[PDB]
Amino acid sequence: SLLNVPAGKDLPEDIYVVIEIPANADPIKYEIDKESGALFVDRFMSTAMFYPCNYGYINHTLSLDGDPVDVLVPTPYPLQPGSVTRCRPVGVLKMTDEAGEDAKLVAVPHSKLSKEYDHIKDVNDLPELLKAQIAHFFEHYKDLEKGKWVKVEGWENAEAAKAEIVASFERAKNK
Amino acid sequence: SLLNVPAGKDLPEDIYVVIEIPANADPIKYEIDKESGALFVDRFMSTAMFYPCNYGYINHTLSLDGDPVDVLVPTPYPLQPGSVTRCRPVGVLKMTDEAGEDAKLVAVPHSKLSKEYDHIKDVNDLPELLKAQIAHFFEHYKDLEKGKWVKVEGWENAEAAKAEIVASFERAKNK
Amino acid sequence: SLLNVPAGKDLPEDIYVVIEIPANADPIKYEIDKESGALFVDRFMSTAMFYPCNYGYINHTLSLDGDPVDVLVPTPYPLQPGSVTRCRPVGVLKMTDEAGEDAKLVAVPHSKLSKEYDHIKDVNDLPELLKAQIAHFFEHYKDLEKGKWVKVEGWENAEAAKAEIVASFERAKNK
Amino acid sequence: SLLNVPAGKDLPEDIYVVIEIPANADPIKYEIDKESGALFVDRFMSTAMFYPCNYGYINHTLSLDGDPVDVLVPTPYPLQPGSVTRCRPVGVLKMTDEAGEDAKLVAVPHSKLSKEYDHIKDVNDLPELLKAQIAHFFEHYKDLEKGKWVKVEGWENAEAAKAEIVASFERAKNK
Amino acid sequence: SLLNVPAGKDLPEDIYVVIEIPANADPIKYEIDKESGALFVDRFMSTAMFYPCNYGYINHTLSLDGDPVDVLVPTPYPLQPGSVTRCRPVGVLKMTDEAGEDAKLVAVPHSKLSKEYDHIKDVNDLPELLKAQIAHFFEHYKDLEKGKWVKVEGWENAEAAKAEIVASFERAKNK
Amino acid sequence: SLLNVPAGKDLPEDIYVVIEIPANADPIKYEIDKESGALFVDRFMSTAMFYPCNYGYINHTLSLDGDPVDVLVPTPYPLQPGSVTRCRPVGVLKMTDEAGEDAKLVAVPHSKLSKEYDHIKDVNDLPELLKAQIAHFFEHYKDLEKGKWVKVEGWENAEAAKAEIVASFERAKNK
Ligand SMILES: [Cl-]
Ligand SMILES: [Cl-]
Ligand SMILES: [Cl-]
Ligand SMILES: [Cl-]
Ligand SMILES: [Cl-]
Ligand SMILES: [Cl-]
Ligand SMILES: [Cl-]
Ligand SMILES: [Cl-]
Ligand SMILES: [Cl-]
Ligand SMILES: [Cl-]
Ligand SMILES: [Cl-]
Ligand SMILES: [Cl-]
Ligand SMILES: [Cl-]
Ligand SMILES: [Cl-]
Ligand SMILES: [Cl-]
Ligand SMILES: [Cl-]
Ligand SMILES: [Cl-]
Ligand SMILES: [Cl-]
Ligand SMILES: [Mn+2]
Ligand SMILES: [Mn+2]
Ligand SMILES: [Mn+2]
Ligand SMILES: [Mn+2]
Ligand SMILES: [Mn+2]
Ligand SMILES: [Mn+2]
Ligand SMILES: [Mn+2]
Ligand SMILES: [Mn+2]
Ligand SMILES: [Mn+2]
Ligand SMILES: [Mn+2]
Ligand SMILES: [Mn+2]
Ligand SMILES: [Mn+2]
Ligand SMILES: [Mn+2]
Ligand SMILES: [Mn+2]
Ligand SMILES: [Mn+2]
Ligand SMILES: [Mn+2]
Ligand SMILES: [Mn+2]
Ligand SMILES: [Mn+2]
Ligand SMILES: [Mn+2]
Ligand SMILES: [Mn+2]
Ligand SMILES: [Mn+2]
Ligand SMILES: [Mn+2]
Ligand SMILES: [Mn+2]
Ligand SMILES: [Mn+2]
Ligand SMILES: [Mn+2]
Ligand SMILES: [Mn+2]
Ligand SMILES: [Mn+2]
Ligand code: NA
Ligand code: NA
Ligand code: NA
Ligand code: NA
Ligand code: NA
Ligand code: NA
Ligand code: NA
Ligand code: NA
Ligand code: NA
Ligand code: NA
Ligand code: NA
Ligand code: NA
C-alpha cells in the first residue's frame, strides 16, 4: 500500500512524494489515512482557491503539525491522487498553522522522469509568480474556516529544504 | 486497504462512505472487489445516464442484494473513486432490484468536513429536484440491460436510513 | 452577434446575462470586446482563485467602471463562455475597484429554464457559504496585480439589485 | 455569424451541422437564437441524462416543431458548441414531441474530415447499442419536465433521412 | 492490493487487465510498483502524444522487457488508473523496445461488462484507423527520449495474442 | 465577428491571435471560416497527437498556404476556441506543408495580460523541450493522412518572426 513507499531512494536529495491533491483541481482537501492507506476527504475548502501545484507528502516523515512533511510538486500535467513521484527538493516555504510548524517543501520531478526541471537548481530558479501564488494560497485558503489559520515566514533555499527533510525523517524515526 | 476502513466512527449517525463512482461522471459502473480491495469495472452502462451524486457503500455492511449497503453522497465537487468521506445519513430511497432488496441511502458530508450540508437534517430538506432525479435514475438506468431491473418503493426519512444502516451492519456481522 | 442581445425580456426582473467566465474554471479573465463581439483574454489571473459562479454581464448597461454591469449566475453545471442565460436578480454585492464603482449582481436561472432556483427569492435565501466565498474572491483575486484593488461594501437585497440594473441600463442609454 | 452558414454544400447528401450540445456533456440544453446567432440556455435538464452524440441542426431548414431540423453527429471526440461540421446523413429516428413532429437525423462526419465513418453507409451500419441509447434518451429525457413529452416512432434509413432533409429545407424556403 | 489480482478467470480467453494510463489522457506514463502496488510516475513523456486506448498489464505475467505483459483496452469512456477490467484478447502488435521484446496485446471489454465489443472477434475486426494509430504511437512516442526506441514488427491475430498471454504467464511462473 | 478583429494594436511587436485549437486538447482540427466567421471542423486528426500550445492565426494576414499566418501561444491554462489573445512574437518554426510555405510563429501573452512570459525575449528563451515537441508534432501529425505532409526547416528568432508577420500582413493587403 502507500503506507509502504520509501521516503526516498537517497534522502534528502532523491525523494518520493505521495500525491494527495492534484494541481489545479477542485477544492477537496484529501489526506491519506495512516491506518488504512486510503484517501479520505479531510475538508471541502470554503474559499474559491486551488492548490497551485500537486500537493502531498514524504512518507515516513513527521512535521510538528503531527503529519508527514508537506510537498508541492510542479508538473506539466496534474497528477493522480494516490500516485507517487520521484522528486528533488529545490526550496521551502516556511510557515506555521494552527496545528504547528508546517513547512511546505517544493520538489521538482527527478531528472530520470523528465529533463524539464533540471534547470531548477535552487529556490531563485522557481518562477517568481509561482512562489508568490503559493505563498498567497497558504496565507488565504483558510480564511473562511474558523480556528484555522496560517503564518507565512518566508521562502528558503534548497539546502534549507534538505535540512527540513532530514529533520522530519528523524522525527518519525524517533517518536 | 479500503477493505479495512471502519463502517463509521459512530454508526448509524456518523459513517464513512467508500466512493466507487463520482458524481456526474461517465457511465462506468465500478465496484470494489472484496478479495483484493481494487476497483473493478462491473459494467459499462448502456443508457445515457449518470449517477446524480457520488455513489458507493458503507464498509462492513451487507444488503440483501449480497453487497455492502449503497450510499449517494452529494458534494460540491465530484469525489475520487476509491476515496472515503465521513457523512451523516439524511434519508433513504427504498427499492429492490434483480439481486434483492437494495436501498439507496443518502448521506451528506459530515459537519467536520463542511458546514454546507448542516441545514440538511432530514429527507424533506433535500431538494425535490434531486430526489426526483435519483428516483428516475434508478428507475431507468437498467432499461437496456436484459434481466436487470428495479422497483422503486419510495423515499423515507433519516430515522429509516439509520435503521437500514444498523440492519445492514448486523447482517454483515452475522453471516 | 452577442452585441445585439437584449438586456432582458422585462428589466429589471427578467434579464439576460452574457457569460464570459464559467464557474469553477481556470483563472483566465475573458471579456467581450465591444467592437467585435469576440471574447478576448483580459488577464491571466495571478492568484490561485476561481470565479465561484459563472460570471458575465447584462448587455446594453454600463457601470461606473466603464463596462456593462457584472453578474454572477449560479448553475448546476458550468456555462459556456459566450453563451446567454435568462435570469432573475436576487441580490447584489456592492463594491468598488480601481476602475470605479463595480457592483456584482447575483441572478439565478429563470423559472422557465429550471425550477431549481425558484426557492431563491432574495439575498438571504442564497447559501451563506456562497455569499462568503464570493465576497472573499473579490476581496483577494487582485492581491498579486499591482495597482488593481477592491473595496467590498456589503451584500444587499433583490430590490437593491433591481435598482442597480435600472441605473446601469439608464447610464448606457444616456452616454 | 452562424446565421449565415449554408445548409450544405450539396443537400441532402452533403450537409453542414451547427452543433449546440457536445456529446457526453453536462445536461444544459443550449439553442442558437435566430435573431442574434448566440447560444442561449433553453433549459437545465431535470433528468440525469446526457445527449449520446453531439447535437444540433441544419441551418436554413424547419421542422414542424418550428425550429431547424435536428441532427445527432457521432465523433471520436466531443465538438465545441457553436462549431460546424460537414456530415453525411445515414439514418433518422422518427419521433414527435409536444412542439410537433421532430425527427432526429443521424449524420456522420464527411469523408473529407475523416475516413472513420465511411463504413457507415446506412442505418443498419450504426451500432445497435448506439441506436438503442438514442431512442431511450429521447423517450426519457423529458420525464421530469411537466407538459414536455416524446413519442418515438422508429428508426428509418438514409433515404428517409435525406427526404426529411429536403422537406425541412423546403419548409424554410416556403414560409 | 492490485498485487493480488488474478491474471484472469480463465486465461488466455478471459483475463483481467490492471489499468495504468487512461485513454486520451495527459502524457504521464504511470507504472504500478511491484513492491508497494502503488502507481508511480515512470516518465513525463516528451512528445505531444497520447495513448490511443487505456493501457496497462496482466498481473502475474512477464514479458522479456522485465515487466508484466502490456495491454491496450478500448472502452467507450476512459478508465481510472489503478482500476481492473475483465477483457477478451483480440489481437497483438508485436514489437521490441530498448528493454526487450515487448508485445502490445489488444483486449476488449468482456461480454459480461458490455455487448459493445462482442462483434470484435479477431484483429481484422478492429478498426483500421485504430490499429494504424496504435502502431504510429509506439513508433514515435519515444522519439525525444535518448536511448529509448521501438521497432514495430506487425499486427497478429487473436490466436497469437492468446499464445503471448500463455507464454508471459509461464515466464512469471518460472523465474 | 472574429472576421473584424485587428491583426494587432502595433504590428509586428503587438499582435492579436485568434485561437482555433486549445492547448492539450482532443485532436479536432478546427478552422475559422472566412465567409461566416464560424469555427468549422477541418479534420479529425488520425494520429494520437495534440497541439503542444494553443493554436490559431493573425487576422488580416496570408501565408503562402492560402490561409492567415499560423501562431502557437503558450499559456498557463488552455484557451477557448474562438477567443482572442494579445501577444508578442518571440520566434518562428519555418516549415512547408502540402499547401505551401507555412511558418509557425510562437507568440507569448503580452505583458499587459501577464508578467509570466516577460522573461521570454527571443527564441532561445523558449524551453528546449517545448521547441522540440513543437517541431516533432508538425513533423508527424500528418503521418496517417495521405497526400498531407510537412518539411520542417528550423527555428528562427524573434526578428525573423516579426519579418514573417509583416510579410503576411502585406500579402493579405495585396491580393
Ligand atoms: Cl524510508
Ligand atoms: Cl497548511
Ligand atoms: Cl513569495
Ligand atoms: Cl466497523
Ligand atoms: Cl441498483
Ligand atoms: Cl422522488
Ligand atoms: Cl435592450
Ligand atoms: Cl472586479
Ligand atoms: Cl459575505
Ligand atoms: Cl443554404
Ligand atoms: Cl426533442
Ligand atoms: Cl432502437
Ligand atoms: Cl493468477
Ligand atoms: Cl513500449
Ligand atoms: Cl497498422
Ligand atoms: Cl488590421
Ligand atoms: Cl500545418
Ligand atoms: Cl527543435
Ligand atoms: Mn479548477
Ligand atoms: Mn492536515
Ligand atoms: Mn499534509
Ligand atoms: Mn497545515
Ligand atoms: Mn502539514
Ligand atoms: Mn452490484
Ligand atoms: Mn453497491
Ligand atoms: Mn443494485
Ligand atoms: Mn446494492
Ligand atoms: Mn474589466
Ligand atoms: Mn465585467
Ligand atoms: Mn472590476
Ligand atoms: Mn465591472
Ligand atoms: Mn458527463
Ligand atoms: Mn427547442
Ligand atoms: Mn433543435
Ligand atoms: Mn424537440
Ligand atoms: Mn426539434
Ligand atoms: Mn488530451
Ligand atoms: Mn516500463
Ligand atoms: Mn508495461
Ligand atoms: Mn516498453
Ligand atoms: Mn512492456
Ligand atoms: Mn488549413
Ligand atoms: Mn492556420
Ligand atoms: Mn498547414
Ligand atoms: Mn497554415
Ligand atoms: Na480544475
Ligand atoms: Na480561519
Ligand atoms: Na461528466
Ligand atoms: Na433491464
Ligand atoms: Na475547474
Ligand atoms: Na493588487
Ligand atoms: Na461529461
Ligand atoms: Na414530461
Ligand atoms: Na485528454
Ligand atoms: Na528515443
Ligand atoms: Na486534453
Ligand atoms: Na501524410
Flag if C48 and A51 touch (Cβ within 8 Å).
Answer: yes
Q: Would you call C44 and F78 a contact, using CB atoms and an 8 Å cutoff?
A: no
E68 CA → ligand 4 middle, Å: 36
| Centroid of ligand 27 to alpha carbon of B166 (angstroms) | 16
**Strand partners for A29:** A43
Closest alpha carbon within chain E to D119:
E127
Instruction: Report the alpha-carbon distance of residue E84 to residue F37 in Å, rounded.
Output: 46
Give CA–CA dist A123/A145, Å, rounded: 30
User: Which candidate, E97, E96, E94, places its Cα nearest to that of E164?
Assistant: E94
SS3 B152: strand
Q: How far apart are CA B151 and CA B140, in angstroms?
A: 10
Quick one: DSSP state of residue B49?
Answer: B
- First and final CA of chain A: distance in angstroms? 22
Q: Which of residues 76 through 105 in chain F touch C, CB cutoff 8 A?
A: 76-80, 82-86
E144–F132 CB contact, under 8 Å: yes
Determine contact, residues C61/C7, Cβ cutoff 8 Å.
yes
DSSP string, A75-140: -SSPPPTT-EEEEEEEEEEEEEETTEE--EEEEEEPTTT-STTTT--SGGGS-HHHHHHHHHHHHH
Identify the helix (H) or strand (E) that includes residue B106: strand B104-109
d(CA A162, CA A11): 8
For residue B101, the cross-strand partners are B96
| C-alpha cell of residue A96 | 506555521
Query: Ligand 19: distance of its center to the CA of A150 in Å?
Result: 23
Are D95 and D153 a contacting pair, CB within 8 Å? yes
Of the candidates D105, D111, D109, D140, the residue with the CA atom closest to the CA atom of residue D123: D105
Chains in contact with C via at least 3 Cβ–Cβ pairs below 8 Å: A, B, D, F
Which value, in Å, is the radius of gyration of the alpha carbons in chain D? 15
Q: What CA–CA distance (Å, rounded) separates C157 from C131?
A: 12
Q: Note the resolution in Å, 1 decimal.
A: 1.2
Which residues of chain D have a CB within 8 Å of the CB of C78?
26
Instruction: Indicate the helix (H) or strand (E) that contains B133.
Output: helix B128-140
Cα–Cα distance, D61 to D83 (Å, whole number): 17
Q: Is F139 left (phi over 0), alpha (psi -120 to 50) or beta?
A: alpha
Decide the pairing of beta strands C70-73 and B15-21. Answer: unpaired
Four-residue CA torsion sign, D31, D32, D35, D38: positive
Whether D115 contacts D121, CB under 8 Å: no
* CB E71 within 8 Å of CB E8: no
Alpha-carbon distance of E18 to E20, in angstroms, equals 7
C109/D41 touch (CB, cutoff 8 Å), yes or no? yes
Three-state DSSP at C148 gives coil
Are D93 and D100 in contact by the 8 Å Cβ rule? The answer is: no
Beta bridge partners of C56: C19, C71
**Inter-chain contact D144–B137, Cβ cutoff 8 Å?**
no
Cα separation, C104 vs D17, whole angstroms? 37
Q: Of E93, E104, E83, E84, whose CA–CA distance to E15 is shortest?
A: E84
> Cβ contacts (< 8 Å) between D115 and chain E: which residues?
129
φ and ψ at residue B18, rounded to 5 degrees: -85, 125
Cα–Cα distance, F10 to F112 (Å, whole number): 14
CB A160 within 8 A of CB A105: no
Q: How far is A151 from A155, CA to CA, in rounded Å? A: 13
User: Which residues of chain F does E134 touch, with a Cβ-Cβ cutoff of 8 Å?
Assistant: 48
Q: Which amino acid is at C169?
A: F
Could you tell me the CA-to-CA distances from B152 to B92, B94, B149, B168 in Å, in that order? 11, 6, 10, 19
Q: Measuring CA to CA, how many Å separate C23 from each of A105, A111, B127, C74?
A: 31, 37, 21, 8
CA atoms in the 13 A half-sphere facing the CB of B164: 29
Per-residue burial over A36-73, b = 16 or more CB atoms within 10 Å of its CB, e = otherwise: bbbbbbbbbbbbbbbbbbbbbbbbbbbbebebbbbbbb
**Closest-CA residue to E160 (of E99, E91, E63):** E91
E-strand spans in F25-149? 28-32, 39-44, 54-57, 70-73, 84-97, 100-101, 104-109
**D125 annotated as belonging to a binding site for a ligand:** no
Q: Could you write out the DSSP letters of every residue in chain E?
A: -GGG--S-SBTTTBEEEEEEE-TT--SEEEEE-TTT--EEEEEE-SSSB--SSEEEE-TT---TTSSPPEEEE--SSPPPTT-EEEEEEEEEEEEEETTEE--EEEEEEPTTT-STTTT--SGGGS-HHHHHHHHHHHHHTTTTSTT--EEEEEEE-HHHHHHHHHHHHHHHHH-
B85 to A40: CB separation less than 8 angstroms, yes or no: yes
Q: Looking at CA atoms only, how far is residue E87 from chain D in angstroms?
A: 19
Q: Does B102 show up as a binding residue in the annotation? A: yes
Q: Pairing relation of β-strands A70-73 and A104-109? A: parallel
Judge contact between E84 and E27, C-beta under 8 A: no
Could you tell me which residues come within 8 angstroms of residue E77 by beta carbon, excluding any fewer than 6 positions away?
Answer: B26, B27, B28, B44, D24
Q: How far is the CA of B126 from the centre of ligand 6 (A)?
A: 10
Helix (H) or strand (E) holding A153: strand A150-156
The identity of residue D163, as a single letter, is: A
In this structure, are residues A168 and A12 in contact, taking their beta carbons and an 8 Å threshold? no
SS3 F152: strand
Question: Whose CA is closest to D68, among D123, D23, D3, D14?
Answer: D3
- Does the annotation flag E102 for ligand binding? yes
* Pairwise CA distance, residues E55 & E87, whole Å: 13
The set of cell numbers assigned to A140 is 488565504
Ligand-binding site membership of C43 (annotated): yes
**For residues C117 and F49, what is the distance between their CA atoms, to the nearest angstrom?**
42
The contacts of residue B88 (CB under 8 Å, 6+ apart) are: B13, B14, B15, B107, B108, B109, B110, B111, B117
Residue from A166, A78, A157 nearest A120 by CA: A157
C-alpha cell at A19: 500525491
Exposed / middle / buried, residue D139 (Cβ in 10 Å: 0-12, 13-18, 19+): middle
Q: Which residues pair with C152 in a beta bridge?
A: C95
Residues of E in contact with D127 (CB under 8 A): 116
Q: Read out DSSP for chain D?
A: -GGG--S-SBTTTBEEEEEEE-TT--SEEEEE-TTT--EEEEEE-SSSB--SSEEEE-TT---TTSSPPEEEE--SSPPPTT-EEEEEEEEEEEEEETTEE--EEEEEEPTTT-STTTT--SGGGS-HHHHHHHHHHHHHTTTTSTT--EEEEEEE-HHHHHHHHHHHHHHHHH-
Checking DSSP bridges between strand F28-32 and strand A15-21, what pairing results, if any? Answer: unpaired
**Nearest CA distance, F77 vs chain E (angstrom):** 14
Segment (H or E) for F167: helix F158-174
- Shortest CA gap D153–chain F (Å): 32
Query: Is C130 in contact with A47 (CB distance < 8 Å)?
Result: no
- Cell, residue E96: 521490441
Interface contact flag, E133 F46, Cβ < 8 Å? yes
Interface size between C and F, measured as CB pairs under 8 A? 58
H/E stretch holding C135 reads helix C128-140
Best CA proximity match to D20, nearest among D6, D5, D30: D30
Distance in Å, alpha carbon of A122 to nearest chain E alpha carbon: 21
Q: Do chains F and B touch (3 or more CB pairs under 8 A)?
A: no
Q: Where are the beta strands (DSSP E) in C24-172?
A: 28-32, 39-44, 54-57, 70-73, 84-97, 100-101, 104-109, 150-156
- Collect all residues of chain B within an 8 Å Cβ-Cβ radius of residue D137: 47-48
Asked if D125 is an interface residue toward chain E (Cβ–Cβ < 8 A), one would say: no
C-alpha cell at D52: 449520446
Look up cell 500463455; give the residue. Answer: E166
Ligand 49 mean position, distance from CA B49 (Å): 14
CB contacts of B79 in chain A (<8 Å) are 28, 41
Chains in touch with B (≥3 Cβ pairs < 8 A): A, C, D, E
What the block records as the C-alpha cell of A167 is 529533520
Is F168 at the interface with chain C, CB within 8 A? no
Within 10 Å of residue A35's Cβ, how many Cβ atoms?
Answer: 9
The answer to whether E18 and E56 have CB atoms below 8 angstroms apart is yes
CA distances from E115 to D134, E79, E170 (A): 16, 17, 31
Burial per residue of A129-150, b for 16 or more beta-carbon CB atoms within 10 angstroms, e otherwise = bbbbbbbbbbbbbbbbeeeeeb
Distance CA D125, CA C162 (A): 56
Question: Nearest bound ligand to CA F36?
Answer: 10
Direct distance between the N- and C-terminal alpha carbons of chain E, in angstroms, rounded to an integer: 22
State whether F39 and D116 contact (CB < 8 Å). no
E·F CB contacts under 8 A: 51
Peptide bond into C12 cis (omega under 30): yes
What are the two backbone dihedrals, phi and then psi, of residue A29, each rounded to the nearest 5 degrees? -90, 95
CB C153 within 8 A of CB C95: yes
Q: Which residues of B touch A41 (CB under 8 A)?
A: 79, 83-86, 109, 113
Residues 6+ apart with CB under 8 A from C121: C90, C158
Q: Determine the residue type at F6.
A: P
How far is Cα E76 from Cα E71, in angstroms, rounded to an integer? 16
3-state secondary structure of B142: coil
Tell me whether residue F128 is exposed, middle or buried, using C-beta atoms within 10 angstroms of its C-beta: 0 to 12, 13 to 18, 19 or more. exposed
Cell numbers that stand for A49 in this block = 482557491
Tell me B153's DSSP state. Answer: E
**What distance in Å separates residue E35's CA from the closest CA in chain B?**
15
HSE at residue C45, side-chain half, CA atoms within 13 A, is 23
Distance CA A31, CA A47 (A): 18
Contact at 8 Å (CB) between A5 and E34? no
The CA distance from E5 to E18, in Å, is 8
Determine the angle formed by the axes of helices D128-140 and B128-140, rounding to 10 degrees: 150
What are residue B3's phi and psi, to 5 degrees?
-65, -25
In 3D space, the residue among B113, D6, D80 whose CA is nearest the CA of residue F33 turns out to be D6
Q: Indicate if the alpha-carbon torsion angle C63, C67, C68, C69 is positive or negative.
A: negative
Domains in chain D: ranges and CATH: 1-175 (3.90.80.10)
A 10 A CB-CB count for B9 gives: 12
Residues of C in contact with D1 (CB under 8 A): 1
Backbone torsions φ then ψ of C141, nearest 5 degrees: -70, -20
Concatenated DSSP letters for C86-106? EEEEEEEEEEEETTEE--EEE
Residues bordering ligand 53, an ion, CB closer than 5 Å:
D 142, 145, 148-149
| Phi, psi for residue F48 in degrees, rounded to 5 | -85, 65
Euclidean distance between CA atoms C134 and C104, whole angstroms: 9
